[PDB]
Amino acid sequence: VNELERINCIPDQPPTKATCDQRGCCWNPQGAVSVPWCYYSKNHSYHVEGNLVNTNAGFTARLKNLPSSPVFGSNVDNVLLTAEYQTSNRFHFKLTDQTNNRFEVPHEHVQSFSGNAAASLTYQVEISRQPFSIKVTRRSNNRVLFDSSIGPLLFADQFLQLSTRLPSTNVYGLGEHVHQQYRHDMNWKTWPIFNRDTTPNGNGTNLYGAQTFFLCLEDASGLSFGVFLMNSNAMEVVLQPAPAITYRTIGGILDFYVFLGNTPEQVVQEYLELIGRPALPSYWALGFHLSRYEYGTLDNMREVVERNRAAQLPYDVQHADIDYMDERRDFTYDSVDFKGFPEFVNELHNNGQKLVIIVDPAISNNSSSSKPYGPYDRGSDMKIWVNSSDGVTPLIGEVWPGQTVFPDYTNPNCAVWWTKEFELFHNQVEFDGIWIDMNEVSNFVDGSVSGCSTNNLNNPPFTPRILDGYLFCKTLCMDAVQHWGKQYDIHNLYGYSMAVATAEAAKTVFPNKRSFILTRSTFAGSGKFAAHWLGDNTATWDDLRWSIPGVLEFNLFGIPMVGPDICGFALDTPEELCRRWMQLGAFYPFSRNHNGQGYKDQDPASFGADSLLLNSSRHYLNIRYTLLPYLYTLFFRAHSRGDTVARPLLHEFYEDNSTWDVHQQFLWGPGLLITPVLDEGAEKVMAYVPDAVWYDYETGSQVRWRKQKVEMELPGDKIGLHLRGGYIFPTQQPNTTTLASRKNPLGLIIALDENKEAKGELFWDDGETKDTVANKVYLLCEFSVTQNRLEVNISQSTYKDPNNLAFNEIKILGTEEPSNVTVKHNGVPSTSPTVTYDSNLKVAIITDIDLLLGEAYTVEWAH
């Protein structure tokens, strides 16, 4: 045995020979660090009994256990393998108890498969019988993608395990964690997954969400595949240098999906097709958001709002944290410190801004006849709470307002209660979106106010390496009871179910609008309902650096609208760190400056009306807003096709192995390269310039760099922004809110490639109505440039913006002097455009032009 292939047979304790012998494993302490001293033997697990049986969907096999006696609970003697050739690029297999029904995730989007095995498979599946293994290979080149033969299948009631070899160490995904790097280097590492309120720091613990998907770039040709495990039980994922990955879960079933694609982007598309593509956001939600924990008073909140508006900061959304509530209670505001809250919301709305309020799941149980609490009263009447293990008494915990009960969002009647609570609150306070927090679910006591009973759910035979080492730590008892089942099985689905419910609520509170939902806890598929933020970070340079892989990973997960708390939640932020964080933060898909209780102000204007931080912030936010039609079109593609929005370099440049672990840079879509300074004291960054033509966004000049590391010079007031040759970027003159910006002239930036060609597109709809894509009420155009000619082509035209919008400026990068510029509208010349040329920089700008949005044009020139 090569020691890098050993599968650890004592994951639970320090290795000893007595235990090894007792478990039938192999003993060989003579390895390197982390190499398992005790590991599974070549032949001792399951075997196929009899023949495989062809089915309409695929095949089944009966697997039978070669007798080994109880280690982590009751073992499953007879396992059923069910395999389905669901599509040409998606393989599904599950391992279940032949004789007993077990918990299976009640996912809201994923459906059971009916009908027939797909034609034209890109993959082939091979099963071995003695012992059992399953292998998925790519048909085109026979590359083995999934191969469980490296280790056993373990299948006990509370311990299920399967391993697979991997064809490369280009592995990305898993969550929710702070991985620090984007690529998993595959040296020995265990990642626990169990939704938990915990700090995203350098310790690598389980965090708020549960995301089992990973993507593997097989080679430089771009060929890639992905694996997803549909299991909501506590689990851990073990990486080793074979290279190989092992999934080790303490409940449910092994329900796997394998996705193949020609590019990493196609693997993401295949995954999102299964689990659900992200919601198209409200266009306003792409603006800058400002927030903090404890303004304390409305007067304080208004002062912050007003100084940032005074500074002309692009600034669409104000969040209001639990300090707006009457004693941290949902669906109230503090009639004293937040006296006049309704008038403030009118002021926000009148300035074209939006209000997002925090809502916690936990409901105060403190209600009397003297002092009634309506949400508790109504929730109790409807009987919609999570119950203790008796199945009838609501479970009591403790969160912000004190003792609380917790909504059971898995019960359809709960969402009716939840909706009515929001419709009543909204009559008082006209919020525009909802921030759901503390939904792991997070509890200030362990399990409940009376703790947890000792039993196999609260105290299982095996516990993954979760923070604090008990399942019920800072959450509900594992034997608590909900409509979908016991908390042991569905704990990881609480935040998911809460987002589903909250989205159901938005149907009523915000009729036919998308609104905005931001969630802390997530499961696979939560991006269909909500944005995400990366949680309670800290104002340190480490946190700044760690933000990028977090953003990228959530994009792979189909939650593209993601960002951290810009400047850092915990701690006073240093000015230089906040300045570099706001530069980068202008380019996070979800851009929010948020701050913890007590710390100094970190809103941009608090640094001074004439500070470099404010100046720089406003400069880069105005760039963000200029480019919002490009960003919005990227979200349209994420929603309708499944593309990422914040994208790793390797997704566009996989042919170049220098891009495979770049994590200090990223792209917006295919064309915009963002290079932040992420080091204290630095005025340069060490960056990689991929193999393309690149133009400096601000000046339009073509960089000398191509396919190389560079020291990019970036002074206190600069972040690197380069546009890729071959791409056309739609823009719109910025303003301080998107309500206003969306009325402005549009522009095109044409970044020419080596052949003087470029392509791009623009999606445009009303920016807020739900189902504009489903109901095909939108504009989609395509731009293409070939040497002497720009064509504006209209592929869908069922929305005409009433603001009479037009392209009034075209900037061409990397061009020789155009001359004789002519504009035609469906063939008819022409109106005679002004052209300015910079011969040194090779930039042409065409003005005094009026190309109506939604109309076909040709713009032609000579050299």
Ligand SMILES: *[C@@H]1O[C@H](CO)[C@@H](O[C@@H]2O[C@H](CO)[C@@H](O)[C@H](O)[C@H]2NC(C)=O)[C@H](O)[C@H]1NC(C)=O
């Ligand atoms: C939690 O306990 C309550 C009782 O406290 C259960 O409420 C039942 O709800 C249905 C209507 O949905 C009624 O028909 C039953 O009569 C209720 N029970 C009683 C005795 O009041 C609720 O079902 C429990 N929840 C779970 C998930 O088991």
Ligand SMILES: *[C@@H]1O[C@H](CO)[C@@H](O[C@H]2O[C@H](CO)[C@@H](O)[C@H](O)[C@H]2NC(C)=O)[C@H](O)[C@H]1NC(C)=O
């Ligand atoms: C940005 O939006 C503001 C609204 O906040 C626009 O404000 C002005 O627009 C008109 C001038 O063309 C005035 O007649 C309005 O009264 C005025 N409103 C204000 C400032 O409160 C402004 O034009 C927009 N600017 C850009 C660059 O688009």
Ligand SMILES: [O-]S([O-])([O-])O[C@@H](CO)[C@H](O)C[S@+]1C[C@@H](O)[C@H](O)[C@H]1CO
């Ligand atoms: O450390 S402390 O801030 O007190 O509490 C954290 C640990 O439980 C919570 O997650 C903070 S919550 C999440 C944070 O975005 C909100 O601003 C806080 C108030 O709603």
Ligand SMILES: *[C@@H]1O[C@H](CO)[C@@H](O)[C@H](O)[C@H]1NC(C)=O
């Ligand atoms: C790990 O957690 C501890 C608290 O238990 C914290 O003080 C420490 O800073 C963390 N370590 C890292 C590497 O961030």
